[PDB]
Amino acid sequence: QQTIQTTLLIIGGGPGGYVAAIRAGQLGIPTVLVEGQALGGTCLNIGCIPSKALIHVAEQFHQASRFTEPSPLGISVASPRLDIGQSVAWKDGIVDRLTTGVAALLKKHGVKVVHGWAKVLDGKQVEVDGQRIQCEHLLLATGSSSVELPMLPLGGPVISSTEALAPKALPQHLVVVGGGYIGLELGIAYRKLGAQVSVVEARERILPTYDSELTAPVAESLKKLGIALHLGHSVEGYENGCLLANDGKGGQLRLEADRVLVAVGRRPRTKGFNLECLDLKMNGAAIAIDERCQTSMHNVWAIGDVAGEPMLAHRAMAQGEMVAEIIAGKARRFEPAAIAAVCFTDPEVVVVGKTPEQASQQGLDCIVAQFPFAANGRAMSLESKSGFVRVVARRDNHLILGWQAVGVAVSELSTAFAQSLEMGACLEDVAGTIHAHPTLGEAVQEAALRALGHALHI
């Protein structure tokens, strides 16, 4: 079998990879992508789309479940049933349509996609199931993997995200080790589907990265939903039919769980393929990269999760397309104004830009203003799930530094938050924009009116 020889070789075919490919095919750089498993990556096959699609079928099961009890809406139904086989078959069709479509556009722009795992040989060649492949620029987009707990190997009963996104039956009591977006999005969805759920988390609170003002609405819904919340506890074992966790000094807890879901973090995928043969500078578990996504070895490039830093899909998609353009001549440098973060928890949290905390750390004097959804008509049409919108701005020129929001159907305000920040808006431009009634985004205009000293509905 003979040498394939290209200009751009990309290791990995998830978000970062297939968009570095598609734009390099588009820009006309000879490109080849290696992909061990299936295209789209973690996002399309066992992340992004299958989680948000399970969350949706969990929401529709929950909403027809509440109508067995009296509601102020006057709707009543008997016998809500969920046999998750079909929920999963549904989920799988969607993943299918989307991987298919990524092949189509990779064919369309003509990049050669070779399957099998790639063992690196040097910063120029690679061996994929026998055939060597050489290139001028190597782009690594190997991704990330889930951290395993030493006394709690995955296997059967201990599943990770990947298997939680794939039941053939649902648990009687599921325990969730880790109270970050993966644990919470999955825990809430397991509870609405009908399983009992407890979240065990080793810090003060759920979503410990985020302040308590913001995170507090989510906590209250888990507590409303019947999801126990053993904070301050760390997990030490699972004595066959029972889980044991301890709180630091001396606390107990024997939770009889028959499914545990470790969702304790994500590590850069740097091992198992010969990355170690190369002189690459590191940043903990991840490859160090400069603002041009290049490693310490010249024509080697890293993007997405392997570069650690914020581990999200749109970050990878946006580093891929930028690398592609730099190799093709265009002068670029990844300095976004912010990378929007969204958690599809009930309620949803959205953080885009600086939090108050962060603004203080960097030594800024801030106007921080908030407008709640209980004073919002749209929110009330929607049975609310109260939270608020918060704005953070420079007290001297009102240049907005960040945006955070908590509430029902808030995820789509992120588009607005990100673009206002990409443009360099001040509170004034946001406040002085007519926002349409009745929408949840009226709260964004009012949270900016309040910072300025003149809100109308609070």
Asked if 238 and 157 count as a contact pair (C-beta separation under 8 A), the reply is: yes
Annotate 224-275 with DSSP letters as a single string: HHT-EEETT-EEEEE-SS-EEEE-TTS---EE--S-EEE---EEE--SSSSG
User: Using CB under 6 A, which residues numbered 313 to 332 contact ligand FAD?
Assistant: 313-314, 316
Asked if 9 and 138 count as a contact pair (C-beta separation under 8 A), the reply is: yes
Distance of CA 322 to the CA centre of its chain: 21
Could you say whether residue 398 binds ligand FAD (CB under 6 A)?
A: no
Could you say whether residue 391 binds ligand FAD (CB under 6 A)?
A: no
Q: How far is the CB of 242 from ligand NAD (least distance, A)?
A: 16
Could you say whether residue 91 binds ligand FAD (CB under 6 A)?
A: no
**Structure tokens, 265:** 């973090």
Across-strand partners of 33? Answer: 10, 113
Return the number of the residue (361 or 419) whose C-beta is nearest a copy of itself: 419
User: Using CB under 8 A, which residues numbered 204 to 263 contact a copy of itself?
Assistant: none
- The yes-or-no answer on residue 435 being catalytic is no
Q: How far is the CB of 56 from a copy of itself (least distance, A)?
A: 5
Measured at the CA of 82, the angle between CA 79 and CA 88, to 5 degrees, comes to 165
Q: Which does 413 bind (CB under 5 to 8 A by kind): ligand FAD, a copy of itself, ligand NAD, none?
A: a copy of itself
Sole binder of a copy of itself in the list 135, 243, 340, 406 (CB under 8 A): 340
Across-strand partners of 127? Answer: 119, 132
Could you say whether residue 423 binds a copy of itself (CB under 8 A)?
A: yes
The kind and range of the H/E element at 44 are helix 41-46
Sole binder of a copy of itself in the list 149, 287, 440, 451 (CB under 8 A): 440
Q: Is the peptide bond before 347 cis (omega within 30 degrees of 0)?
A: yes
216 assigned binding-site residue: no
Could you say whether residue 407 binds ligand FAD (CB under 6 A)?
A: no
Return the number of the residue (235 or 425) whose C-beta is nearest a copy of itself: 425
Could you say whether residue 96 binds a copy of itself (CB under 8 A)?
A: no
Across-strand partners of 5? Answer: 134
Measured at the CA of 418, the angle between CA 413 and CA 421, to 5 degrees, comes to 125
Could you say whether residue 64 binds a copy of itself (CB under 8 A)?
A: yes
Return the number of the residue (39 or 263) whose C-beta is nearest ligand NAD: 263
Could you say whether residue 55 binds a copy of itself (CB under 8 A)?
A: yes
Cα-flanking dihedrals φ and ψ of residue 364, to 5°?
-115, 150
Alpha-carbon distances, residue 287 vs 126, 139, 268, 290 (angstroms) = 18, 12, 8, 10
Could you say whether residue 331 binds a copy of itself (CB under 8 A)?
A: no
Sort residue 15 into left (φ over 0), alpha (ψ -120 to 50) or beta. Answer: alpha
36 assigned binding-site residue: yes
258 assigned binding-site residue: no
User: Using CB under 6 A, which residues numbered 2 to 21 contact ligand FAD?
Assistant: 11-17
Could you say whether residue 107 binds a copy of itself (CB under 8 A)?
A: no
Annotate 194-207 with DSSP letters as a single string: T-EEEEE-SSSSSS
Task: Considering the candidates 109, 398, 435, 437, report the single residue annotated as catalytic.
Answer: 437
Sole binder of a copy of itself in the list 69, 89, 130, 363 (CB under 8 A): 89
Return the number of the residue (151 or 436) whose C-beta is nearest a copy of itself: 436
Stretch in the footprint of a copy of itself (CB under 8 A) among 210-218, 238-246, 266-274, 374-382:
374-382
Return the number of the residue (201 or 321) whose C-beta is nearest ligand NAD: 201
Distance of CA 416 to the CA centre of its chain: 19
Could you say whether residue 375 binds a copy of itself (CB under 8 A)?
A: yes
Could you say whether residue 392 binds a copy of itself (CB under 8 A)?
A: no
Q: How far is the CB of 289 from a copy of itself (least distance, A)?
A: 17
DSSP 397: T
Could you say whether residue 391 binds a copy of itself (CB under 8 A)?
A: no
Sort residue 95 into left (φ over 0), alpha (ψ -120 to 50) or beta. Answer: alpha
Burial per residue of 363-402, b for 16 or more beta-carbon CB atoms within 10 angstroms, e otherwise? ebebbbbbbbbebbebbeeeebbbbbbbbbbbeeebebbb
The kind and range of the H/E element at 141 are none
Q: Which does 235 bind (CB under 5 to 8 A by kind): ligand FAD, a copy of itself, ligand NAD, none?
A: ligand NAD
Site for ligand NAD, rule CB under 6 A: 177-183, 200-203, 208, 234-235, 263-266, 308, 310-312
- Amino acid in the structure at residue 215: T
Stretch in the footprint of a copy of itself (CB under 8 A) among 44-52, 145-153, 155-163, 211-219:
44-52
Q: Please report, in range form, the residues annotated as the binding site for FAD.
A: 35-43, 52, 118, 141, 181, 305, 313
Q: Which amino acids are annotated catalytic? A: 437
